[PDB]
Amino acid sequence: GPAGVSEYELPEDPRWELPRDRLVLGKPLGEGCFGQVVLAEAIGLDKDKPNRVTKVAVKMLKSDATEKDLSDLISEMEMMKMIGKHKNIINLLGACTQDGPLYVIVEYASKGNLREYLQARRPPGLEYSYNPSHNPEEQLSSKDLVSCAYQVARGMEYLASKKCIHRDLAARNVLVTEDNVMKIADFGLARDIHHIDYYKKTTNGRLPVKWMAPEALFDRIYTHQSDVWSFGVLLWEIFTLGGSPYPGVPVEELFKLLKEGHRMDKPSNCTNELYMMMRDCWHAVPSQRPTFKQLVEDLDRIVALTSNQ
Numbered sequence: 001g002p003a004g005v006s007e008y009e010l011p012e013d014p015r016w017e018l019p020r021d022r023l024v025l026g027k028p029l030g031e032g033c034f035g036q037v038v039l040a041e042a043i044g045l046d047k048d049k050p051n052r053v054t055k056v057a058v059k060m061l062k063s064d065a066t067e068k069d070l071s072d073l074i075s076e077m078e079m080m081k082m083i084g085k086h087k088n089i090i091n092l093l094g095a096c097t098q099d100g101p102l103y104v105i106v107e108y109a110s111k112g113n114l115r116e117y118l119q120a121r122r123p124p125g126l127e128y129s130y131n132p133s134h135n136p137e138e139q140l141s142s143k144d145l146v147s148c149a150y151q152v153a154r155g156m157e158y159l160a161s162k163k164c165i166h167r168d169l170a171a172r173n174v175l176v177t178e179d180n181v182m183k184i185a186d187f188g189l190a191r192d193i194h195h196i197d198y199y200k201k202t203t204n205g206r207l208p209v210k211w212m213a214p215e216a217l218f219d220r221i222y223t224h225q226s227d228v229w230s231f232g233v234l235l236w237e238i239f240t241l242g243g244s245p246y247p248g249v250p251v252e253e254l255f256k257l258l259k260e261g262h263r264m265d266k267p268s269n270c271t272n273e274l275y276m277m278m279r280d281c282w283h284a285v286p287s288q289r290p291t292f293k294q295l296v297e298d299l300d301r302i303v304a305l306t307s308n309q
C-alpha cells in the first residue's frame with residue numbers, strides 16, 4: 001500500500017543502500033540541521049562480514065522537513081560520495097532511501113565535538129578556564145594537542161584537494177572518535193543561496209562570524225584561503241582547550257577591529273612557533289596565508305619535536 005511512500009524520488013544507490021532492518025537504533029546524539037542524529041548498531045554493514053555489528057551515526061529527516069531540507073540532506077550525502085574517504089573526515093557509510101524515512105549513515109565519533117572534548121580535559125590552574133565537565137577526563141599531553149591540529153589540517157588538505165570549501169571550520173565542527181581520531185564534520189553541506197544573519201546564534205549558542213575571514217565578513221567571499229583563516233581560529237581553540245574566540249569583543253565590532261589589525265592574543269600555554277602559525281593563518285591578505293599543504297608539513301615536524309611528557 002502507498003502509506004508512507006515518499007512523494008519524492010529519493011536516489012537509490014545499490015553500493016550504499018542498507019535495509020533499515022539492519023539498523024538497531026540507540027541513544028540520541030542531538031538535533032542536526034535536518035533532523036535527529038541517532039547512534040545505531042548496523043548489522044552486516046560490511047557485506048564481507050554479514051554477522052558483525054558496527055556502531056554508526058544515523059542522520060534523519062525531521063517529520064516537518066521542507067523540500068529544501070530534503071534536497072539539502074540528499075545533496076550532503078551525494079557530496080560525501082564525490083569527495084571520497086579520508087581518515088580525518090566524517091565518512092559516509094550508507095543510506096536508507098526505501099521502505100521508510102530517509103536516513104544517511106555516517107561514521108560515529110563517540111567522544112563528540114572537539115570543543116567539549118577539550119573542555120572536559122582542562123587541568124586546574126592558571127593557564128586555562130575552569131573545567132565544566134562533571135566527568136572530567138585525563139589531561140592531554142602537549143604532543144596530543146599538536147597532533148589534534150595536525151589531524152584537522154590533514155583532513156582539510158584532503159578536502160581542499162577535492163575542491164571542497166568548508167566555510168565554517170571550528171572546533172564544534174570537529175568530532176572525536178573512540179580512538180581519539182579527529183574527524184571534520186559538516187564539510188558536505190551546500191552553501192545557502194540566501195544572505196546569512198551575522199548575529200544569529202547556532203542552536204548550541206555559537207556565533208560563526210567569529211571564524212569568518214575578513215573577506216568572508218565583508219564580501220561573503222569564501223575560498224580555501226578563508227578556511228585557512230578559520231583554521232587559525234581553530235588552533236587558538238585547541239590551545240585554550242576549548243576557549244571562546246575574541247573574549248569580551250562584541251560581534252558587531254569584530255570586522256572593524258580585524259581591519260585595524262586586531263588579532264587574538266597568544267594563549268597562555270602555546271609556543272611562540274604555534275602562535276606564529278596562528279598569526280600567519282590570520283594574514284589580512286588571503287594570498288599571503290599558508291596553504292593546508294604547508295600547514296600539514298609544518299605540523300608534522302612540530303608534532304615530532306613536541307614532548308608527550
Ligand SMILES: *CCC(=O)Nc1ccc2c(-c3cccc4ncc(-c5cnn(CCN6CCOCC6)c5)nc34)cn(C)c2c1
Nearest residue numbers: 029030031032033037057106107108109110111112185186
Ligand atoms: C546544521 C548543523 C548541525 O546540526 N551539524 C551537526 C553535525 C554533526 C552532528 C552529529 C554527529 C554526526 C556524526 C557522528 C557523530 N558522532 C557522535 C556524535 C555525538 C554527539 N554527542 N555525543 C556524546 C558526547 N559526549 C561527550 C561526553 O562524554 C560522553 C559523550 C556524540 N555526534 C555525531 C550529531 N549532531 C547533532 C550533529 C549536528
